[PDB]
């Protein structure tokens, strides 16, 4: 069983991760709360695309609230005392929030394309997006379960996607969870936003560089901030072996990859208010008014 090496996490990485997570958590919460306050309070800002932006902001806020604290608890405690149902919901809420965020990004890209393409210029879209996001997270809500173990003397409890499950489709999900997540929550929104924004820029060519620069920055930050976690999980699924001492090092390094990637995902959640500040004069003044007083 031994890999010729234990599994453990360096303390330097833990300190770095704690500081980065604290800063990104604070920044994202402040930015998204300020954006929501601005959009709701100001009547002139209550409009279709602004409601899409508010949907994206609320999704990002709920994503931040549910991820950073639990990962901090994991790193600083290495225990899950919350029971089976709490870990039954946390993956469900997390995936629902990620789906809401990605689909809101898609919808907002579509809205910008329409605004720049047609000059004649949402409730059904937001409800449709959110309902579809909640249902797609159901497998997580019925899948995870707690299992007990002895490991080199220490008695442990882990809540995970238990390999043994009841139905054929539930087993299929147990086997293809990571592939499904990488093919839906990452590739689909990236492709949709990039394509629609490319169409918007192409139309601007048919009819200002700063807005294109903002588009490029948003898409690039999304990619660079959501890539690492998917990369870590696919590396687990691809290079993890068994029966021989060639797997523990991969697990130890994957801990680092996963925690870095979740920090980057939180940073992507945090990014949008900063962009809407540095780009939009109306939002710039709104942030100045709300924050400075």
């Amino acid at each position: 069983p031994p890999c010729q090496g234990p599994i453990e996490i360096k303390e330097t990485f833990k300190y770095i991760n704690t500081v980065v997570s604290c800063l990104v958590f604070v920044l994202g919460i402040i930015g998204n709360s300020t954006l929501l306050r601005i959009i709701y309070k100001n009547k002139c800002m209550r409009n279709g695309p602004n409601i899409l932006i508010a949907s994206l902001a609320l999704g990002d806020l709920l994503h931040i609230v549910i991820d950073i604290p639990i990962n901090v608890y994991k790193l600083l405690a290495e225990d899950w005392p919350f029971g089976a149902e709490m870990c039954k919901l946390v993956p469900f809420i997390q995936k629902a929030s990620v789906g809401i965020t990605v689909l809101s990004l898609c919808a907002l890209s579509i809205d910008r394309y329409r605004a720049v393409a047609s000059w004649s210029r949402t409730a059904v879209e937001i409800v449709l997006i959110w309902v579809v996001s909640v249902v797609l997270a159901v497998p997580e809500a019925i899948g995870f379960d707690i299992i007990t173990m002895d490991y080199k003397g220490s008695y442990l409890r882990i809540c995970l996607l238990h390999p043994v499950q009841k139905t054929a489709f539930m087993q299929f999900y147990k086997t293809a969870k990571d592939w499904w997540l990488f093919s839906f929550y990452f590739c689909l929104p990236l492709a949709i936003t990039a394509f629609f924004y490319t169409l918007m820029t192409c139309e601007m060519l048919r009819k200002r560089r700063e807005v294109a620069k903002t588009v490029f920055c948003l898409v690039l930050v999304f990619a660079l901030c959501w890539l690492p976690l998917h990369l870590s999980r696919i590396l687990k699924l691809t290079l993890y072996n068994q029966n021989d001492p060639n797997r523990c090092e991969l697990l130890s390094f994957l801990l680092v990859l996963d925690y870095i990637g979740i920090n980057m995902a939180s940073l992507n959640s945090c990014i949008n208010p900063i962009a809407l500040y540095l780009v939009s004069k109306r939002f710039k003044n709104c942030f100045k008014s709300c924050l400075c007083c």
Partner: peptide, 21 residues
């Protein structure tokens, strides 16, 4: 995280130390 079974001790230990995702 995902494991092949309960016999692979190291995979489930990684699940213990891994993030909730």
């Amino acid at each position: 995280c995902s494991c092949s079974s309960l016999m692979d001790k190291e995979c489930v230990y990684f699940c213990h130390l891994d993030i909730i995702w």
